[PDB]
Subunit: 121 residues, 4 copies
Amino acid sequence: AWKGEVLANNEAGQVTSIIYNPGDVITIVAAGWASYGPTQKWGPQGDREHPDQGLICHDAFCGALVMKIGNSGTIPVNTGLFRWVAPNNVQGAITLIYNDVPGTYGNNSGSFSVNIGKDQS
Amino acid sequence: AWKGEVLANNEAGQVTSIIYNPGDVITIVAAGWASYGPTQKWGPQGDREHPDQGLICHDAFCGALVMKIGNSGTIPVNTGLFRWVAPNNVQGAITLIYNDVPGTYGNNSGSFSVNIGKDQS
Amino acid sequence: AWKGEVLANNEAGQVTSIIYNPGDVITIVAAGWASYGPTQKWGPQGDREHPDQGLICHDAFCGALVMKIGNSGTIPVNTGLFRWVAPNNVQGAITLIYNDVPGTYGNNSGSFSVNIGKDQS
Amino acid sequence: AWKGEVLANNEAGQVTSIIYNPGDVITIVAAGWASYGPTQKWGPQGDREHPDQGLICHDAFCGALVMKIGNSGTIPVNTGLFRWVAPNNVQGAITLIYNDVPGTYGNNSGSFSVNIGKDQS
Ligand SMILES: [Ca+2]
Ligand SMILES: [Ca+2]
Ligand SMILES: [Ca+2]
Ligand SMILES: [Ca+2]
């Protein structure tokens, strides 16, 4: 299992110790407060009122927690995933990333605290 | 395991099928959008800017998800709990509740979708 | 989870730290060598050639590992149980017992090493 | 998870659907009755009285359940493994095998019923 912080300004993302393998079931829980620029902060579902202006994940709001598994496209995490199985052919190291527009991470602040574990399978 | 909706306006709370017993390890993941009155909505950590004016749980923000286990006091849930063990002497049915001031739930809206499972122990 | 030794000569049985509660899923693995009297020893399935002459569990062989949950009747364990749920209305402390005839445990020898854990549910 | 039968006469072994990956925790429970030649049968720990005359696994008795993980050497399973982690650098498909001497499987009989699951990690 892995526990760590994902900084909102970390454009490259936070690599974890989890390698997602075919058949794995995982659970993620994410908590905390972060911002994509404003003084206000939002939780791991991000800001439901902010327009998508080129987010790395178009299936989640700006300021949401997302992930990549190996060389996958981004997958929403939001507050977490409960006993979750990846799509077919998706495997590799899990990297967690704050959802923002490439090149605009510099004014970001805060972080999410995230737990990932593998479940029975 | 249990999955269901917790309505923001449900003052009595949403009873689940989970009976927390001594030694149990549980995981909760909560998602969604709710409000304690305003047109804006917040996630399961609630509104970090709103003053506590008599919330059922003073250890979480207004609009956060909280719970009671049996006849316990309220315990924050927020976005969820990862492989969590209850304090000593805490046991019984888990009821999930939106954090608001008693008697002020009528203007609430939205809901959270919540999964609870028991983990290995 | 619990790990410990179950002595073949322990007529009252070995109490564990596991309280089986409604809905629990458990796994047991049992190992080792024991005898109900002869110099030969048998594993946790017991001796398939020995007649039942009043065993505490008539659904397992003499020399098998069995259990009681609370005040239940005996339930075969044998080599173990994989992600197992008890019958309706069965609950309480798990006691592990060597299967022999009441009053004939004195000439027994050896023991089984047993792990019990609760699984996801 | 996988459940299936491992025939005592299956020299090549029974391939399972489990791929053991680095970091995995697994549980195995094995049950049943098999023989390496005699009319008598033994459980998954085999025959503690039979000399080793070239067994595929010298760390378990003749007639015991053993396994290979990928291209590993044989590893004892016996009655099972509880929340078990493999040695460093061991990974791949799990094949279950009855422990006997190469070229002497033809007179074997019976089988073991085996469950394998991955546990939390
Ligand atoms: Ca930004
Ligand atoms: Ca309100
Ligand atoms: Ca005896
Ligand atoms: Ca043979």
